[PDB]
Amino acid sequence: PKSKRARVYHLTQVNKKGREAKERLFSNIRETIPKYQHCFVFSVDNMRNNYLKDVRHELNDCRIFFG
Amino acid sequence: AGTINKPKKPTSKRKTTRLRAKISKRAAEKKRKERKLARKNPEWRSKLKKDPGIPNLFPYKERLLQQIEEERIRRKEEL
Amino acid sequence: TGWKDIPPVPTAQEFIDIVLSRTQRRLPTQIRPGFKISRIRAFYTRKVKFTQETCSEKFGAIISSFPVLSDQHPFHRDLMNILYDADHFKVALGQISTAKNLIETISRDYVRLLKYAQSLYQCKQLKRAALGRMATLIKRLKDPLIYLDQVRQHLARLPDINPTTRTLLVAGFPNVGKSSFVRSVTRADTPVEPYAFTTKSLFVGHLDYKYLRYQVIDTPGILDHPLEEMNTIEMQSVTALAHLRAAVLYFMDI
Amino acid sequence: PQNEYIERHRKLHGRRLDAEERARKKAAREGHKNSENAQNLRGLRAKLYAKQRHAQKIQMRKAIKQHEERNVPSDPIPSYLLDRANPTTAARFSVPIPKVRGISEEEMFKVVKTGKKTHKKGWKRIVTKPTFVGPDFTRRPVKYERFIRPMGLRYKKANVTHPTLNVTVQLPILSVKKNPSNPLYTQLGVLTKGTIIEVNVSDLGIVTASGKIAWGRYAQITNNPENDGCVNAVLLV
Amino acid sequence: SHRKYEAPRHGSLAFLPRKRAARHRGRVKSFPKDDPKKPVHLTAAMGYKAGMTTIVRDLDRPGAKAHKKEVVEAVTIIDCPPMVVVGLVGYIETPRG
Amino acid sequence: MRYIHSEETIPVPENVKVSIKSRLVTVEGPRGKLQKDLSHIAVNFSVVKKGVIGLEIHHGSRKDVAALRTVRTIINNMIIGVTKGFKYKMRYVYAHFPINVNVEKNAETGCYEVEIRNFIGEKIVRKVVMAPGVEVEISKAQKDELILSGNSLEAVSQSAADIQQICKVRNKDIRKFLDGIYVSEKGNIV
Amino acid sequence: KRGAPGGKLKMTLGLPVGAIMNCADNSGARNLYIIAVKGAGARLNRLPAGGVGDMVMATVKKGKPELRKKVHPAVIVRQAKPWKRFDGVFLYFEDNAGVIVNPKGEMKGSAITGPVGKEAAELWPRIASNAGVVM
Amino acid sequence: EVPKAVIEPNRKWFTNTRVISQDTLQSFREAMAEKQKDPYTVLLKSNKLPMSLIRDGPKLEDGLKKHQAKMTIEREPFSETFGPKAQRKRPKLSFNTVDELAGYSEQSLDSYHARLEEKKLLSVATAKEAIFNKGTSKRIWNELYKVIDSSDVILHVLDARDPLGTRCR
RNA sequence: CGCGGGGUUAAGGUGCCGGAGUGGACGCUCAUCAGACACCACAAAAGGCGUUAGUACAUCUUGACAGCAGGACGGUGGCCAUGGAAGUCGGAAUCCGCUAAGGACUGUGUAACAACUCACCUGCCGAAUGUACUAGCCCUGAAAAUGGAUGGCGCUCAAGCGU
RNA sequence: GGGAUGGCUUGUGGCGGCCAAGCGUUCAUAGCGACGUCGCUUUGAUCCUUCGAUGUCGGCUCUUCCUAUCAUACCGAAGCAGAAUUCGGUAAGCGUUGGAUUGUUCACCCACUAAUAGGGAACGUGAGCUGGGUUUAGACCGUCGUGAGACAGGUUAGUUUUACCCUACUGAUGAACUCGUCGCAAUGGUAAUUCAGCUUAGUACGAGAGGAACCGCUGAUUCAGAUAAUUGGUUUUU
Ligand SMILES: [Mg+2]
């Protein structure tokens, strides 16, 4: 296929994460499991979710994963 | 361009004997000159060329690698 | 009158492309080795002379179109120094004239050599040598051409201030209503805003009083520090106050 | 209008209502347009387009490689010479050009015809290559001038490069020492490729071991002055 | 080599050949295009050239310099006795005309 | 490579009737009838399912396989035209000279006609004839707005483009002279 | 704007390049030598020529020395070659004469001696204002 | 016949052909300083000398003037002075106080009026006739330079009625 | 290479001119003067969002590639400079927190802010993709001047190209 | 007696150093190397530095072709406000002038103009007319030569003189088909061009100075085809 969309190489600082981010998320969750008495599941459906920053600040003794 | 409505003078594909002979002579001279330059070439050349190897899409490449291992082990045992 | 009739100043690469495309297209290109040597000499001599003539026309147009600072009224001379550094202005035009003279010298030398060249190959080499040396000289002018094109655009948009007519010069601190007064008495579109240095260049409007035409000059504001600490914006107003014989309206906000 | 009036007009009235859409669509059509130019332009215009596209592709590759490598003087000089533009600075007594193309007398000299009859006398010869005539030169009378060295082909200076110091200076020519094709060419002072000339090296500031100033040295001509319109030489050091 | 000073060619090649006309009576090469919605009418007539004379015209040409003024103009008189109709020719359309 | 079989599908709504004969497609809806000849494209039409049209190409190259996507969208646009319709809103703006737009319906031809006057003070009257089936109305909700509506998207958008191109400023700086008639909204009637 | 006036009907041109005509004004010049005609077209070997009402470029051969060193625009007001007006009248004057003007048509001198033609008077309002007789 | 054009290896190619001592240079500089011109003496044979090491240097005013432009560009490049990336904020002035500015404006206006009056004291005109270009032809000046190249003595002939008028400087 | 009859071939050919195949097999190619007796030059490591066949590296149901809906933050208006300058006129540094992720910022924008946008992340979706090279064929890779040439017609799953 | 370089060329210098993606090489780490870069080759100046004919071009008339486009037409871009332009694209349909200057490479000046574009068909030898390179015999001066004479040269005067042939071209007749009248239309040719004025409008636009365009109207330039009422010219109306 000679006719193709030219891919834009980005001259920006931040690169794609890859499998390293997945393994880091795995290790962070599995290392936070033994330190806490309860693990809640919460849902935020069709919401902007920028207020989770304030929720994380308020619950400073808790650990929130949103991955 | 307005080629379809107003075409220009055609570029002839009919060769002349003079140009054919001159092109043949220049090609022969270029072959001789290239042979001479290859004979006086100072660029380094490898004794053995680099092998491409086995293509990855060949479905029994791993089996061929196993056979290569077995052959070299048998050769080492025999020697 | 103004300075809108200055022709556009190309970059060095655009200049080279323009000159060489004129030479390529406005002259015949096909010459044969089997022709007479005088015919070959005439062909390449004409190529070199035409290239030099195009360069001379464009450089001379640049030199003759831009203002001569020494020929201006002292207001326009000082204002031009404020807007563009006068040393840089004269230096850029000096480089243009020097390149024009050197291109003519190169053309004369290679025409003289083409008088004695003995073959098409030698004539072609001398022609290419002359054109390449001209292109090198033009390529050395990269920064002055960019600077002069920017100066040309700003000069084209400068307001026309007659320095010997009836003029009202509105001066003062920033934010005291200078542009508001000028908008209220003239038709000039000088913006009015609450922040300091809304007006960054001289603006001129006009009015009629007793069947006579007056010009009114809105200025950037002036701060209370000596002349050595003033930037170019405030120094435009200082130049207008120093060199224009006018009626000065100093605006104050009590 | 005065000052930045088109910018003020944009501030007060905006642009045309389809301006952003048309610009976006044209930028989107640029890929097809560039391919159409690559396949349909002709002649010199096509050649210049292809060369300039080659230059863009090389520059883009360099920028991409530098951005990949974002996450990763030579000779000792004193402090007063730091941050200046300094040159890079990179028995058998053989010259750099030991052999050049030989020039026959037929190529060197052309016949100047004299006389008013249809058959012309042909004893005069004109030198077709650049020459050096030396100081205090007065031409022979025309009745006794066999060899014509025209004034437009006479040279006095040369662009001499020093191989060790890596500098090129324009220097006066002192004399022509040896034209490799013919001693007659040497005597006439012909400046062709491979010719050994004597040059004035006062500007180069060369001091001998005894403290004397060396102002005359030998250079070899490395170009063809009859084709270039200049004399280029390399100092023999 | 090229002609040094340009000049247009003498005469029009549209009126070639400059031979004698094949007939004394002029030939109507083309009649006006027929519109069937118009009423029936004749498209041509014959006459005999008698000579020329001079007239004075009271000109009504708005925008012209000679507007509302008298102009002297040359005219041609054609003697036109009535024609007599004696025949009718029918024409069909074929792929050869 | 030649692909043995390639297929696309078009869903048909309940109020639509589609008739295809020798690649001549006729689409019937509440809003009327549209027709389109697709015999320049090699395609086999079928009824795969109740309310689904199947399009297929046999032994085709990549280009022939790709052409079915165009055929699919073209027929889907005819279906959308006979169901919901197409509507293009245009806005005309000016600086000093008010643009006068008058809309008539030619009784002889059945087409709408748009006359544009006083475009930057010009004295000529610009006349654009709409494609048959395109209706033009001057809006009452908004100032200086025309509304072109119809069943055929191509006819509506080409009529809008003809109006856009007839009012072109020539030999003036277009950073400064902003007058014109521009397409401002595209959508469905329903 | 160039010197050629608009709205001028075709007339017989009587004065080609090289003609010397009288100066009908009091600017100091006695005669005018035509070197060019405004509005003349391009034709091989054809001398440019003007008639009454045309602007030409002229040099002064006889007159004040201050006028000798310049090329002045001039308007032909009288010609001796017969020409026809639109009323069928063929007419001519007894000499060829013109007046020096500027490119805007305003006269250098302040009075005109003799009559001027209707064509020149109608095309140039300053000449019409300075004419005593119009024929 | 094409010859063999070859340069033999030789130690003479890599030596100094002409050397001069510092004492000799100083003596020649003293000769430079004490040289006087006599119309009744002619030059018969020039001495081959390194004259760039002997002659007096340029005057300091011309030496600084000849580098002022490149100095100003090296100090302040064109793109930093005017343009979209320009950083110039402080102008260069010929005055430092408001009183000096008032005096400067007065003197500038006087000089401007003086130059206008000088220019004023100093229909298009007809072209200069081609007869007044005689004596400036390329053919004539080619003949002149040919004669100069061929002659040892040059007799410049002057009309006694107008000697400086006929003198060719 | 004597004068003849019959038979068979070489080089070259078998759409018509033209004797002999619109012969067979698998592919490739669409040229705004293709190509058909090319090799040389133009001409390069040349330019192609033409079209196929490959090689290598890489991503991917732990959801790739394209999109759409949203996030894109806090120390912080980081330092210097500037009339003003807050990621976005400049000079130089370019770290930390919260992180799922988010540059001391990729562009638009403001006098400066604001606002928008990109990098990067999440949800929806759903199965294959991306990049760089290599080999074919095709286009461009420079042309003058009376009207003309694959020998001519003409030929496009060829009557072109490879076997 | 013998004769009378060419699928060349075009727009971007040479020499020297450095860098360099890549090519090679990886028992040697050399060698090649695009894109680039750096060195040599007046603050808008000076006008007191014109640097060698062995090589020859012209002019008139007239036709055609190329496009490498000066103008006219359309179009893309630019602080392109308007006006005037500049850079570029398609385009050869249509134009592309009149003079001065020979103490000279006759090339540059002046003006008109919409514009005063560049070439080929000769100059890769070459019977149209007529000037210069140019040169038989007469003559003078300069340089050389003892001289006859020759030339670094300069000046003056000076014999080639078809066409009725074939073809081509332009026109004109014509056999065969009874004579004639009215027609058709294959094919070949083909034609128009540019400017100005009035209106729009002192309007859009503009701080001001200034200042358009479409529709509408009237002339003129160059070209082309006719004509003779009138005005000039011509007179063997002898
Ligand atoms: Mg304010």
Short mmCIF file of N, CA and C (backbone and C1' of nucleotides) in Angstrom, two decimals, chain J residues 82-113:
data_model
loop_
_atom_site.label_atom_id
_atom_site.label_comp_id
_atom_site.label_asym_id
_atom_site.label_seq_id
_atom_site.Cartn_x
_atom_site.Cartn_y
_atom_site.Cartn_z
P G J 82 -6.90 45.98 -0.56
"O5'" G J 82 -7.45 47.33 -1.17
"C5'" G J 82 -8.84 47.62 -1.20
"C4'" G J 82 -9.07 49.03 -1.66
"C3'" G J 82 -8.36 49.42 -2.94
"O3'" G J 82 -9.00 48.98 -4.12
"C1'" G J 82 -7.98 51.07 -1.31
P A J 83 -8.13 48.35 -5.31
"O5'" A J 83 -7.17 49.53 -5.76
"C5'" A J 83 -7.67 50.69 -6.42
"C4'" A J 83 -6.60 51.71 -6.64
"C3'" A J 83 -5.36 51.23 -7.38
"O3'" A J 83 -5.53 51.16 -8.79
"C1'" A J 83 -4.69 52.40 -5.47
P A J 84 -5.00 49.87 -9.58
"O5'" A J 84 -3.41 49.98 -9.49
"C5'" A J 84 -2.72 51.11 -10.03
"C4'" A J 84 -1.33 51.23 -9.47
"C3'" A J 84 -0.39 50.07 -9.75
"O3'" A J 84 0.19 50.11 -11.04
"C1'" A J 84 -0.28 50.60 -7.47
P U J 85 0.46 48.76 -11.85
"O5'" U J 85 0.84 47.71 -10.71
"C5'" U J 85 2.03 46.95 -10.78
"C4'" U J 85 2.73 46.89 -9.45
"C3'" U J 85 3.56 45.64 -9.21
"O3'" U J 85 4.82 45.69 -9.85
"C1'" U J 85 2.29 46.15 -7.27
P U J 86 5.36 44.44 -10.69
"O5'" U J 86 5.95 43.46 -9.59
"C5'" U J 86 6.93 43.90 -8.67
"C4'" U J 86 7.12 42.93 -7.54
"C3'" U J 86 7.17 41.46 -7.93
"O3'" U J 86 8.44 41.05 -8.38
"C1'" U J 86 5.70 41.73 -6.10
P C J 87 8.57 39.91 -9.50
"O5'" C J 87 8.26 38.56 -8.72
"C5'" C J 87 9.12 38.09 -7.70
"C4'" C J 87 8.56 36.86 -7.04
"C3'" C J 87 8.06 35.77 -7.97
"O3'" C J 87 9.07 34.98 -8.56
"C1'" C J 87 6.46 36.14 -6.29
P G J 88 8.91 34.49 -10.08
"O5'" G J 88 7.73 33.42 -10.03
"C5'" G J 88 7.92 32.17 -9.38
"C4'" G J 88 6.61 31.48 -9.05
"C3'" G J 88 5.79 30.94 -10.20
"O3'" G J 88 6.32 29.76 -10.78
"C1'" G J 88 4.36 31.96 -8.63
P G J 89 5.98 29.38 -12.30
"O5'" G J 89 4.47 28.89 -12.26
"C5'" G J 89 4.08 27.69 -11.61
"C4'" G J 89 2.62 27.40 -11.82
"C3'" G J 89 2.15 27.36 -13.26
"O3'" G J 89 2.44 26.13 -13.88
"C1'" G J 89 0.64 28.65 -11.99
P U J 90 2.68 26.05 -15.47
"O5'" U J 90 1.24 26.17 -16.10
"C5'" U J 90 0.23 25.23 -15.80
"C4'" U J 90 -1.08 25.63 -16.42
"C3'" U J 90 -1.01 25.93 -17.90
"O3'" U J 90 -0.99 24.76 -18.68
"C1'" U J 90 -2.26 27.62 -16.81
P A J 91 -0.40 24.82 -20.17
"O5'" A J 91 -1.57 25.54 -20.95
"C5'" A J 91 -1.32 26.17 -22.17
"C4'" A J 91 -1.96 27.52 -22.25
"C3'" A J 91 -1.25 28.42 -23.23
"O3'" A J 91 -1.61 28.10 -24.55
"C1'" A J 91 -1.69 29.62 -21.24
P A J 92 -0.45 27.78 -25.59
"O5'" A J 92 -0.04 29.24 -26.05
"C5'" A J 92 -1.01 30.10 -26.64
"C4'" A J 92 -0.44 30.82 -27.82
"C3'" A J 92 0.09 29.94 -28.94
"O3'" A J 92 -0.11 30.60 -30.19
"C1'" A J 92 1.86 31.23 -28.02
P G J 93 -1.27 30.12 -31.19
"O5'" G J 93 -2.62 30.62 -30.51
"C5'" G J 93 -3.88 30.39 -31.13
"C4'" G J 93 -4.85 31.52 -30.90
"C3'" G J 93 -4.38 32.91 -31.29
"O3'" G J 93 -4.54 33.16 -32.68
"C1'" G J 93 -5.38 32.98 -29.15
P C J 94 -3.54 34.13 -33.48
"O5'" C J 94 -3.61 35.51 -32.70
"C5'" C J 94 -4.69 36.41 -32.87
"C4'" C J 94 -4.47 37.65 -32.03
"C3'" C J 94 -3.17 38.38 -32.31
"O3'" C J 94 -3.26 39.22 -33.44
"C1'" C J 94 -3.45 38.11 -29.98
P G J 95 -1.97 39.49 -34.35
"O5'" G J 95 -1.59 40.98 -33.96
"C5'" G J 95 -0.26 41.35 -33.69
"C4'" G J 95 -0.17 42.25 -32.49
"C3'" G J 95 1.23 42.73 -32.16
"O3'" G J 95 1.59 43.87 -32.92
"C1'" G J 95 0.21 41.89 -30.21
P U J 96 2.88 43.84 -33.85
"O5'" U J 96 4.07 44.24 -32.86
"C5'" U J 96 3.89 45.27 -31.89
"C4'" U J 96 4.76 45.03 -30.68
"C3'" U J 96 6.21 44.67 -30.96
"O3'" U J 96 6.99 45.82 -31.25
"C1'" U J 96 5.32 43.27 -29.26
P U J 97 8.34 45.73 -32.13
"O5'" U J 97 8.25 47.01 -33.08
"C5'" U J 97 7.10 47.26 -33.86
"C4'" U J 97 6.63 48.69 -33.74
"C3'" U J 97 7.63 49.77 -34.13
"O3'" U J 97 7.77 49.96 -35.52
"C1'" U J 97 6.63 50.35 -32.08
P G J 98 9.13 50.54 -36.13
"O5'" G J 98 9.11 52.08 -35.75
"C5'" G J 98 8.11 52.95 -36.24
"C4'" G J 98 8.26 54.34 -35.67
"C3'" G J 98 9.62 54.99 -35.89
"O3'" G J 98 9.74 55.54 -37.18
"C1'" G J 98 9.00 55.23 -33.63
P G J 99 11.17 55.60 -37.90
"O5'" G J 99 11.92 56.75 -37.11
"C5'" G J 99 13.29 56.66 -36.78
"C4'" G J 99 13.64 57.70 -35.74
"C3'" G J 99 15.12 57.92 -35.49
"O3'" G J 99 15.70 58.80 -36.44
"C1'" G J 99 14.00 57.67 -33.43
P A J 100 17.18 58.55 -36.97
"O5'" A J 100 18.10 59.14 -35.82
"C5'" A J 100 17.91 60.46 -35.35
"C4'" A J 100 18.72 60.71 -34.10
"C3'" A J 100 20.17 60.28 -34.18
"O3'" A J 100 20.97 61.25 -34.82
"C1'" A J 100 19.22 59.53 -32.14
P U J 101 22.00 60.80 -35.96
"O5'" U J 101 23.19 60.14 -35.14
"C5'" U J 101 23.91 60.91 -34.19
"C4'" U J 101 24.65 60.03 -33.23
"C3'" U J 101 25.56 58.98 -33.84
"O3'" U J 101 26.79 59.50 -34.31
"C1'" U J 101 24.30 58.01 -32.09
P U J 102 27.34 59.08 -35.75
"O5'" U J 102 27.80 57.56 -35.57
"C5'" U J 102 28.77 57.20 -34.59
"C4'" U J 102 29.96 56.51 -35.21
"C3'" U J 102 30.40 57.03 -36.58
"O3'" U J 102 31.83 57.03 -36.65
"C1'" U J 102 29.97 54.71 -36.70
P G J 103 32.65 58.32 -36.16
"O5'" G J 103 33.61 57.74 -35.03
"C5'" G J 103 34.83 57.09 -35.38
"C4'" G J 103 35.95 57.59 -34.51
"C3'" G J 103 35.66 57.65 -33.02
"O3'" G J 103 35.88 56.40 -32.39
"C1'" G J 103 36.59 59.70 -33.72
P U J 104 34.75 55.72 -31.48
"O5'" U J 104 33.93 54.80 -32.49
"C5'" U J 104 32.54 54.56 -32.29
"C4'" U J 104 32.13 53.15 -32.63
"C3'" U J 104 32.77 52.04 -31.79
"O3'" U J 104 31.80 51.04 -31.48
"C1'" U J 104 33.14 51.64 -34.10
P U J 105 31.57 50.60 -29.95
"O5'" U J 105 31.50 49.01 -30.01
"C5'" U J 105 32.66 48.22 -30.27
"C4'" U J 105 32.37 47.16 -31.31
"C3'" U J 105 31.29 46.16 -30.93
"O3'" U J 105 30.32 45.92 -31.98
"C1'" U J 105 33.33 45.01 -31.40
P C J 106 30.63 45.65 -33.54
"O5'" C J 106 29.19 45.77 -34.21
"C5'" C J 106 28.70 47.00 -34.71
"C4'" C J 106 28.56 48.05 -33.62
"C3'" C J 106 27.41 47.87 -32.64
"O3'" C J 106 27.73 46.97 -31.59
"C1'" C J 106 27.59 50.15 -33.34
P A J 107 26.93 45.59 -31.39
"O5'" A J 107 27.26 45.19 -29.88
"C5'" A J 107 26.30 45.35 -28.84
"C4'" A J 107 26.51 46.64 -28.08
"C3'" A J 107 25.34 47.08 -27.21
"O3'" A J 107 25.37 46.50 -25.91
"C1'" A J 107 26.01 48.87 -28.59
P C J 108 24.21 46.82 -24.85
"O5'" C J 108 24.72 48.12 -24.08
"C5'" C J 108 23.82 48.90 -23.30
"C4'" C J 108 24.01 50.38 -23.56
"C3'" C J 108 22.79 51.25 -23.30
"O3'" C J 108 22.66 51.60 -21.93
"C1'" C J 108 23.71 51.80 -25.41
P C J 109 21.36 52.37 -21.41
"O5'" C J 109 21.68 53.90 -21.72
"C5'" C J 109 20.73 54.90 -21.41
"C4'" C J 109 20.72 56.01 -22.43
"C3'" C J 109 19.36 56.60 -22.69
"O3'" C J 109 18.96 57.51 -21.68
"C1'" C J 109 20.45 56.22 -24.75
P C J 110 17.55 57.31 -20.96
"O5'" C J 110 16.56 58.10 -21.92
"C5'" C J 110 16.93 59.36 -22.43
"C4'" C J 110 16.09 59.76 -23.60
"C3'" C J 110 14.62 59.42 -23.51
"O3'" C J 110 13.89 60.27 -22.65
"C1'" C J 110 15.41 58.90 -25.67
P A J 111 12.79 59.65 -21.66
"O5'" A J 111 11.48 59.55 -22.56
"C5'" A J 111 10.99 60.69 -23.24
"C4'" A J 111 10.25 60.33 -24.50
"C3'" A J 111 8.99 59.51 -24.33
"O3'" A J 111 7.88 60.29 -23.91
"C1'" A J 111 10.25 58.67 -26.14
P C J 112 6.66 59.61 -23.13
"O5'" C J 112 5.87 58.83 -24.27
"C5'" C J 112 5.24 59.54 -25.33
"C4'" C J 112 4.77 58.60 -26.41
"C3'" C J 112 3.83 57.50 -25.96
"O3'" C J 112 2.49 57.95 -25.79
"C1'" C J 112 5.48 56.58 -27.35
P U J 113 1.61 57.43 -24.56
"O5'" U J 113 1.52 55.86 -24.80
"C5'" U J 113 0.84 55.33 -25.93
"C4'" U J 113 1.17 53.88 -26.13
"C3'" U J 113 0.70 52.95 -25.02
"O3'" U J 113 -0.67 52.65 -25.12
"C1'" U J 113 2.94 52.43 -25.59
#
